[PDB]
Amino acid sequence: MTELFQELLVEDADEELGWQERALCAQTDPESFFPEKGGSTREAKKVCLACEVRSECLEYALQNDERFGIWGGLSERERRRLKKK
DNA sequence: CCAGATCGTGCGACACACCGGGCCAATTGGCCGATGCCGTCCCGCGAACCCCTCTACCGTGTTGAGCAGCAGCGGCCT
Numbered sequence: 189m190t191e192l193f194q195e196l197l198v199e200d201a202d203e204e205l206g207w208q209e210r211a212l213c214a215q216t217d218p219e220s221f222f223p224e225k226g227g228s229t230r231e232a233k234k235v236c237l238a239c240e241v242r243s244e245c246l247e248y249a250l251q252n253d254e255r256f257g258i259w260g261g262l263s264e265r266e267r268r269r270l271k272k273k
Numbered sequence: 274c275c276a277g278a279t280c281g282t283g284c285g286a287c288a289c290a291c292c293g294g295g296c297c298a299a300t301t302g303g304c305c306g307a308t309g310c311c312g313t314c315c316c317g318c319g320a321a322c323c324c325c326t327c328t329a330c331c332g333t334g335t336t337g338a339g340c341a342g343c344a345g346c347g348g349c350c351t
């Protein structure tokens with residue numbers, strides 16, 4: 189349908205700062221990614237599943253070692269066990 | 274002519290609509306409490322850092338043009 193022939197051939201920016209700009213969650217409620225009280229961690233996991241820079245997000249999160257929120261489709265203890273493994 | 278598409282109607286299934294129950298998984302996220310390394314500070318000494326002081330064969334010198342005010346002088350006036 190309205191796919192623009194996979195981004196088409198009309199582009200003038202020819203400039204990218206980094207993989208932040210390709211983040212899908214930026215098009216989405218930030219609050220849902222930090223479940224307070226008990227919360228849930230599956231809808232935002234589904235959102236991350238379709239992210240095109242999931243690997244980069246996971247790598248950056250692990251390298252900087254944030255212990256809050258859900259990054260790369262994984263929550264805190266998945267990151268912790270991956271770090272410990 | 275007359276037979277399937279369309280639709281009427283019917284029976285069933287049925288994917289949930291409800292609105293209410295009764296428990297549970299995941300997943301907590303706090304810092305609880307205990308343990309440990311770094312920032313700040315107070316000397317301790319020493320290198321340097323800046324200021325002050327003194328040395329007595331003796332030695333004695335660095336263009337043109339325009340406009341205006343002041344000093345010297347010739348010459349009355351008394």
Ligand code: SF4
Binds near residue numbers: 212261
């Ligand atoms: S993987 Fe990272 S960048 Fe992508 S949507 Fe999830 S949190 Fe955002």
